[PDB]
Amino acid sequence: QEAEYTLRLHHFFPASAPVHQEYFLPWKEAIEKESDGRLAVELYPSMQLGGTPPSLYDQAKDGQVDIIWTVLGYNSGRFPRAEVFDLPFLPTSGAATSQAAHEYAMTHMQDELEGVYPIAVHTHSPGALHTKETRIEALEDIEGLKMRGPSRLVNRYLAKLGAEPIGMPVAQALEALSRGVLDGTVIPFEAITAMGLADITTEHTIFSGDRALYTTMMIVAMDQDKYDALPEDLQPIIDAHAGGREAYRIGQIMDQADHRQILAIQSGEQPGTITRLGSEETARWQAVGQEVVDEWIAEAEEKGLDGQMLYDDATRLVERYTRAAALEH
Numbered sequence: 001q002e003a004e005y006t007l008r009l010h011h012f013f014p015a016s017a018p019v020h021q022e023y024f025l026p027w028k029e030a031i032e033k034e035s036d037g038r039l040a041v042e043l044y045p046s047m048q049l050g051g052t053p054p055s056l057y058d059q060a061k062d063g064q065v066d067i068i069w070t071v072l073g074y075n076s077g078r079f080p081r082a083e084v085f086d087l088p089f090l091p092t093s094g095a096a097t098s099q100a101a102h103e104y105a106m107t108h109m110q111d112e113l114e115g116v117y118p119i120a121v122h123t124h125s126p127g128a129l130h131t132k133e134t135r136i137e138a139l140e141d142i143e144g145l146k147m148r149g150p151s152r153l154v155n156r157y158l159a160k161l162g163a164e165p166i167g168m169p170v171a172q173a174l175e176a177l178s179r180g181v182l183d184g185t186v187i188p189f190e191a192i193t194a195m196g197l198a199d200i201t202t203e204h205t206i207f208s209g210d211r212a213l214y215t216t217m218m219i220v221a222m223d224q225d226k227y228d229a230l231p232e233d234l235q236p237i238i239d240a241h242a243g244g245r246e247a248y249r250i251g252q253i254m255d256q257a258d259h260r261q262i263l264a265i266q267s268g269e270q271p272g273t274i275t276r277l278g279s280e281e282t283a284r285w286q287a288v289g290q291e292v293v294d295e296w297i298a299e300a301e302e303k304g305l306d307g308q309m310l311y312d313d314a315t316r317l318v319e320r321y322t323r324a325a326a327l328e329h
Ligand SMILES: O=C(O)/C=C/c1ccc(O)c(O)c1
Pocket: 013, 017, 019, 071, 124, 125, 149, 150, 168, 169, 170, 171, 186, 187, 188, 190, 191, 194, 254
């Protein structure tokens, strides 16, 4: 049957990106099939419908497009309750941390997310250090490195670690590294794959223990007005492909793509070196991490927010969904 509604989905990553290939294409396929063609989904990668990645959230909210995928922290100050998921050593896997992020959003961010229908509120998989030249074997090695992070709280951590943070969306990272504006970038390994950085940032540092260095909250966001405009028999077709299960799935795709990329480097199929900092060394980065946590909670409280409560709930949810994933397998 002919399209009753065409949904334009706009994002900042290339079509070859794992989340595009393994989530957005199947999402398109299921929405079009289950709607018997009454819903058409058009995917627009690489900012093909214009603007820059910080503009994405409002493109969906304001209805310039129907669906976006973005980083909430690309808009500094805008999603203060979401910032709890940027904190050091809070996250585990993409899969578990995403499910925690979706539940957290549903229970704490109803005001912050007013005007968008959340298909998935999720995080990326473990954030790691990627550099052009410097093998980071110790805290001292990051001193004075120009490092790109996605958000003011990850940049805050990078500065407390003794780096020089330069805030920008990861889409500027290729050119900035190319021209010597950056020494490197934090991102998960699947983002290395996506952005074609494997042959540029060839030094990679990961950590010891039951928590990743950091992550950041992302969103697959639908214009609430466009959802509200759908007939009562097409709204449930969206609902069937929206919520915490979708967030878990996005995190799982990234986790799997991380593993492929890390294996490819370790095997010598792709040039690079992976350096895992031992327990004692990691403990040094976690001790700085705690100072950022303590600071954020104090900042939050002075500003009215119950930061301590939001931090306790975010950490409880990560542990809950991590243990549930661990018990199953
Ligand atoms: O740090 C950033 O600015 C973006 C991070 C990001 C974006 C897309 C992904 O699929 C992913 O794993 C990480």
